[PDB]
Write a protein that binds this ligand. Structure first.
Ligand code: VZV
Length: 85
């Protein structure tokens, strides 16, 4: 009840990087989302603060083509839209 419950499309995201649970602290979520971005190589060599998720499950979930890591509010909005209420 400290924790938060992923909607199952994001929870399938988390397991494609080795996650075992189905509830999580925010930290776990942020950390797994980062696995993803760095494993699936979703970024520009030119400007590395932009993540491009255009043709990818991540983009699906967040409903965007791309977004900047410097933009937290906007990130948490995207994450929460995927949290079981
Ligand atoms: C991938 C991740 C481990 C990490 C960053 C990261 O390392 N990235 C960004 C893509 C290219 C690569 C890079 O070389 N940079 C240092 C800019 S830069 C960076 N900052 C972190 C810690 C972060 C965490 C929470 C928020 Cl709300 C925003 C940013 C965190 C993060 C976590 C979740 C998401 Cl969805 C996006 C970014 N993040």
């Amino acid at each position: 009840e400290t924790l938060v419950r992923p909607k199952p499309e994001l929870l399938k995201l988390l397991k494609s990087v080795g996650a075992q649970k189905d509830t999580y602290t925010m930290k776990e979520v942020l950390f797994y989302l980062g696995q993803y971005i760095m494993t699936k190589r979703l970024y520009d060599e030119k400007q590395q603060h932009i993540v491009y998720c255009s043709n990818d499950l991540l983009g699906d979930l967040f409903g965007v083509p791309s977004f900047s890591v410097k933009e937290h509010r906007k990130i948490y909005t995207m994450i929460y839209r995927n949290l079981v209420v």
